[PDB]
Ligand binder design. Sequence first.
Ligand SMILES: O=C(O)c1ccc(-c2ccccc2OC(F)(F)F)o1
Ligand SMILES: [Mn+2]
Ligand SMILES: [Mn+2]
Ligand code: NA
Length: 262
Amino acid sequence: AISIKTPEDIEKMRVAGRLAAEVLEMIEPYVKPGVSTGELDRICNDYIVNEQHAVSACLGYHGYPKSVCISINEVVCHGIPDDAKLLKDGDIVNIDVTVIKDGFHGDTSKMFIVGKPTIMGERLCRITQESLYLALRMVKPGINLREIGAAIQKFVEAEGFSVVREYCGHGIGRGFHEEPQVLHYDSRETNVVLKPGMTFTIEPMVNAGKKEIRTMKDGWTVKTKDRSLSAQYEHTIVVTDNGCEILTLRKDDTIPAIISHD
Ligand SMILES: O=C(O)c1ccc(-c2ccccc2OC(F)(F)F)o1
Ligand SMILES: [Mn+2]
Ligand SMILES: [Mn+2]
Ligand code: NA
């Protein structure tokens, strides 16, 4: 079954979601040429622990060594912050945050373009975010997740890009990853009709080249097989009576927090 959050639970999710979003708003100025992904991670963790009085759900999860995931260019996901990896002009970087506050999880990520942006990097990030937005605009009770996954894939592939199959969105609450699975492509296996109160994430991973990926030897880093650029954006949401509410909205988001279909 899919857990239907209570008004009280949803309010706790709003708090956790806001905190996650605020980590991304906070780190923005630090994402520039020369900075290491390792330092970015420490800055995020100190902020979460000392200022938000929360905890990173990533640190130690399934054995993950850091507080946030930072993936650059061809890295698809789960990039491990390293003191020796420095951002450079033109890089596109995803910082993925997940905070636990008062028992509930807030999960979100965004792409940052470092230094002078390249038109393709800028295009891939924009299209990826738009694929997330178009999906969010479809969320409402009665619709099947298969439809949303189908729409994301259709849009992304129409741009000459591909959708990563190995990873998906997920239900979220007191647990980091809960049912249901939220695929970002069409699958004959998906059959989940949305209901008010459900809280989950949408987080498409899009490759500029082919969909195939490769896992490095550190047991976490995932890259595109052809080494093409890959981008991702993620938001945690709650299904309302007539649509949804984005719990991890940021000041830079170009979409409203509350999406009504009334
Ligand atoms: O956004 C997510 O759901 C996400 C990001 C990273 C992960 C993850 C999933 C399984 C094992 C480790 C993972 O990385 C981390 F521990 F950092 F959460 O899940
Ligand atoms: Mn995430
Ligand atoms: Mn997630
Ligand atoms: Na990438």
